[PDB]
Amino acid sequence: AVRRALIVLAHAERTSFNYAMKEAAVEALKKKGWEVVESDLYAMNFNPLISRNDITGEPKDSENFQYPVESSLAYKEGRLSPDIVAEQKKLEAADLVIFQFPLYWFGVPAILKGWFERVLVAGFAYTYATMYDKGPFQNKKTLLSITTGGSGSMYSLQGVHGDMNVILWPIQSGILRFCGFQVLEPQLVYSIGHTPPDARVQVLEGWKKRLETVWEESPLYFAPSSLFDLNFQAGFLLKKEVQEEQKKNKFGLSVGHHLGKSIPADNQIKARK
Amino acid sequence: AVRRALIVLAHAERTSFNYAMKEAAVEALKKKGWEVVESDLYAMNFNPLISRNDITGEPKDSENFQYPVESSLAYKEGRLSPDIVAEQKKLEAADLVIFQFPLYWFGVPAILKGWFERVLVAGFAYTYATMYDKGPFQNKKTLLSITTGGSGSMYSLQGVHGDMNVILWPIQSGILRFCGFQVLEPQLVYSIGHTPPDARVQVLEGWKKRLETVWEESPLYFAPSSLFDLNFQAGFLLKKEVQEEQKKNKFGLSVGHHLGKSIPADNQIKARK
Ligand SMILES: Cc1cc2nc3c(=O)[nH]c(=O)nc-3n(C[C@@H](O)C(O)[C@@H](O)COP(=O)(O)OP(=O)(O)OC[C@H]3O[C@@H](n4cnc5c(N)ncnc54)[C@H](O)[C@@H]3O)c2cc1C
Numbered sequence: 062a063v064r065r066a067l068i069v070l071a072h073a074e075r076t077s078f079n080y081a082m083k084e085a086a087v088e089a090l091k092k093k094g095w096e097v098v099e100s101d102l103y104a105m106n107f108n109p110l111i112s113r114n115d116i117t118g119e120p121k122d123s124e125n126f127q128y129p130v131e132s133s134l135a136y137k138e139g140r141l142s143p144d145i146v147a148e149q150k151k152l153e154a155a156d157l158v159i160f161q162f163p164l165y166w167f168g169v170p171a172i173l174k175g176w177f178e179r180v181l182v183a184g185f186a187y188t189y190a191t192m193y194d195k196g197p198f199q200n201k202k203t204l205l206s207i208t209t210g211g212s213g214s215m216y217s218l219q220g221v222h223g224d225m226n227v228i229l230w231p232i233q234s235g236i237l238r239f240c241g242f243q244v245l246e247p248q249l250v251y252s253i254g255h256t257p258p259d260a261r262v263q264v265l266e267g268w269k270k271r272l273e274t275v276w277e278e279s280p281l282y283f284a285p286s287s288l289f290d291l292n293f294q295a296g297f298l299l300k301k302e303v304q305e306e307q308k309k310n311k312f313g314l315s316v317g318h319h320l321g322k323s324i325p326a327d328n329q330i331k332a333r334k
Numbered sequence: 335a336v337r338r339a340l341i342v343l344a345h346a347e348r349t350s351f352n353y354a355m356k357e358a359a360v361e362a363l364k365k366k367g368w369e370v371v372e373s374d375l376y377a378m379n380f381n382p383l384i385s386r387n388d389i390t391g392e393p394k395d396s397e398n399f400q401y402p403v404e405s406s407l408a409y410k411e412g413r414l415s416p417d418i419v420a421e422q423k424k425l426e427a428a429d430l431v432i433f434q435f436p437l438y439w440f441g442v443p444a445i446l447k448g449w450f451e452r453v454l455v456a457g458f459a460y461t462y463a464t465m466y467d468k469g470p471f472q473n474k475k476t477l478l479s480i481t482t483g484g485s486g487s488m489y490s491l492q493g494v495h496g497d498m499n500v501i502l503w504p505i506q507s508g509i510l511r512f513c514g515f516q517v518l519e520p521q522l523v524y525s526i527g528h529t530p531p532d533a534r535v536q537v538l539e540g541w542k543k544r545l546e547t548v549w550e551e552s553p554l555y556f557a558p559s560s561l562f563d564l565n566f567q568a569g570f571l572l573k574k575e576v577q578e579e580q581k582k583n584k585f586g587l588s589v590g591h592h593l594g595k596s597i598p599a600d601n602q603i604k605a606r607k
């Protein structure tokens with residue numbers, strides 16, 4: 062339906078603009094009647110490190126201990142650690158999930174990276190036979206909310222750092238669409254250490270205004286899994302007919318699936334095909 | 335009723351942030367159901383200079399031409415210039431009026447100063463026996479929306495330019511509340527030439543969010559005219575009882591009515607007392 066939200070935050074300081082963006086979002090969504098839950102990872106002392114200690118009881122094979130095998134088993138059998146279970150339960154009840162984080166070394170902080178590695182367990186979050194739009198999270202919606210030290214022109218096609226849509230693809234496709242989520246446009250706050258105090262208040266009003274209609278937004282484009290031959294004889298490659306029809310197009314289907322052609326503009330930043 | 339709005343703009347360039355603020359307000363108000371009318375003063379070639387040529391026909395006394403006397407007669411008799419009448423029609427039909435302008439030399443631009451001098455006529459906009467809350471515009475609301483080159487801290491109690499509530503008082507009390515308007519909080523945009531391009535888009539989004547519930551806000555405080563003895567024998571001075579009660583108060587009633595004491599605190603920038 063449209064009624065439970067989980068907000069996951071990755072910042073230690075409560076004086077941060079990232080903390081302030083979190084607070085604005087609980088307020089807008091409580092005003093429309095949503096139930097809201099939080100996973101403030103540093104205030105929770107969350108352990109970010111994957112290891113054989115995430116399992117209880119007996120490993121199926123301690124000689125050649127292999128994390129994907131072991132943890133889906135432990136998940137079927139109810140042998141996972143209590144901090145992992147409490148998070149899996151939050152996730153399962155939420156209709157919408159927001160991730161709030163500063164950009165560190167062109168990716169997510171180590172503490173949010175460790176939460177993805179320990180909570181999104183084989184069999185709970187994915188299966189190698191139901192990847193991408195067939196994933197367990199198909200009825201849920203999600204979005205990244207990111208602040209940056211650098212300006213918006215440094216991350217454009219012609220700036221020193223290169224294109225932002227290329228920085229976002231490993232996260233939005235590789236983790237989130239992988240598990241079946243409907244991914245929505247990011248919220249990007251550029252130049253935050255250089256914007257005047259009264260303009261920052263307006264950046265927060267603008268965020269709350271968007272959240273009044275988030276559940277009816279359109280999602281970003283990802284190539285569907287039906288365009289591909291999913292088995293080891295074909296090599297998980299695009300079907301021959303789709304390869305034939307695509308020959309006529311000036312543009313690749315997305316950032317990771319550019320096909321040697323031009324990437325369609327802002328594929329990872331603006332909605333619609 | 336609550337349904338018609340008039341927006342008066344004072345900037346010659348269509349590439350300005352002031353023009354962008356005006357365009358977001360027409361949009362926000364029209365999605366809510368309002369009828370919007372505009373007075374884009376520089377696109378109208380509006381004449382800002384008051385003179386005996388604003389009157390058609392008969393000066394009651396050309397030897398000693400006195401502008402307030404002559405224009406109220408001309409108003410009763412229908413002898414005013416046609417650019418003044420067309421402006422007076424928009425105003426008489428508007429429930430909300432918004433003035434949009436850049437701060438020039440701690441005041442309003444000369445083209446907007448000239449529209450107050452020519453359009454707010456003795457007899458139409460005021461009388462000397464119905465000043466302030468007894469004025470003809472009792473039923474209407476208005477607000478100033480201002481952009482500034484200097485920062486927010488240069489205009490605080492401790493900044494080089496001194497307090498912004500003192501700059502706003504001659505306009506908001508002396509012109510707007512004198513004619514009977516309920517004055518709403520100003521929209522203040524500081525440091526516009528030093529704010530990053532991405533944050534400037536959110537300044538416009540926060541302004542359209544405010545406009546969705548504007549008619550429901552409370553007005554700024556001004557001392558009511560009933561506290562005063564309004565005739566030349568008393569001197570238009572505060573009543574003796576009021577003077578007595580006020581002796582026990584730490585604060586002044588407002589910025590112009592500070593009374594030798596402390597000015598109450600953001601009297602001209604935040605509503606209610
Ligand atoms: C490990 C590391 C690597 C980095 N890598 C990158 C990188 O790859 N690329 C890049 O661009 N940047 C990088 N950065 C820098 C960058 O992402 C930031 O420092 C930035 O995200 C700051 O956000 P913050 O939430 O920490 O804000 P803060 O440093 O807290 O500052 C935000 C401003 O907002 C103010 N504020 C807080 N709350 C409010 C409020 N309620 N209302 C109004 N104002 C308020 C604060 O006073 C402050 O002045 C890196 C930094 C680190 C430490």
Ligand SMILES: Cc1cc2nc3c(=O)[nH]c(=O)nc-3n(C[C@@H](O)C(O)[C@@H](O)COP(=O)(O)OP(=O)(O)OC[C@H]3O[C@@H](n4cnc5c(N)ncnc54)[C@H](O)[C@@H]3O)c2cc1C
Binds near residue numbers: 436439482534535
């Ligand atoms: C005679 C005079 C006296 C002055 N006196 C004062 C004074 O008393 N005190 C004081 O503080 N300042 C004063 N100023 C300066 C000051 O008020 C400003 O220059 C300021 O208000 C500029 O606003 P603007 O709309 O003219 O901006 P612009 O010069 O147009 O700049 C605004 C920026 O917004 C950008 N922009 C336009 N539309 C958009 C949009 N759609 N979205 C995002 N970005 C957009 C433009 O590219 C531009 O970079 C004075 C200036 C003059 C000429």
Ligand SMILES: Nc1c(S(=O)(=O)O)cc(Nc2ccc(Nc3nc(Cl)nc(Nc4ccccc4S(=O)(=O)O)n3)c(S(=O)(=O)O)c2)c2c1C(=O)c1ccccc1C2=O
Binds near residue numbers: 209211212254
């Ligand atoms: N003239 C400059 C300048 S300019 O600022 O004068 O425009 C700037 C400039 N580089 C230059 C580029 C970016 C930043 N500032 C910058 N950048 C980032 Cl990616 N993040 C942040 N964040 C930031 C900003 C303010 C407060 C806190 C923070 S935070 O680190 O904790 O997030 N600031 C800064 S700083 O001065 O503000 O530290 C200098 C250069 C140059 C050069 O001329 C130049 C010539 C030859 C080689 C190199 C350069 C050069 O690099």
Ligand SMILES: Nc1c(S(=O)(=O)O)cc(Nc2ccc(Nc3nc(Cl)nc(Nc4ccccc4S(=O)(=O)O)n3)c(S(=O)(=O)O)c2)c2c1C(=O)c1ccccc1C2=O
Binds near residue numbers: 483484485527528
């Ligand atoms: N170091 C500075 C600096 S600082 O900027 O380097 O911090 C700043 C500074 N003053 C200083 C104060 C204001 C502004 N800029 C400033 N100010 C206003 Cl009131 N409006 C605007 N508007 C504006 C800004 C950008 C673009 C267009 C426009 S507009 O003209 O069209 O509105 N800019 C600027 S500017 O360099 O950006 O022009 C320098 C000073 C000093 C001094 O050291 C100093 C020492 C002795 C006496 C005086 C000073 C001094 O005044």
Ligand SMILES: CC1=C(C)C(=O)C(C)=C(C)C1=O
Binds near residue numbers: 167210211222
């Ligand atoms: C560490 C670091 C990197 C990689 C960056 O690219 C930028 C933009 C900032 C601010 C930064 O601090």
Ligand SMILES: CC1=C(C)C(=O)C(C)=C(C)C1=O
Binds near residue numbers: 439440484495
């Ligand atoms: C002319 C002028 C005056 C009087 C000011 O105070 C400020 C702030 C600016 C920008 C300005 O340009």
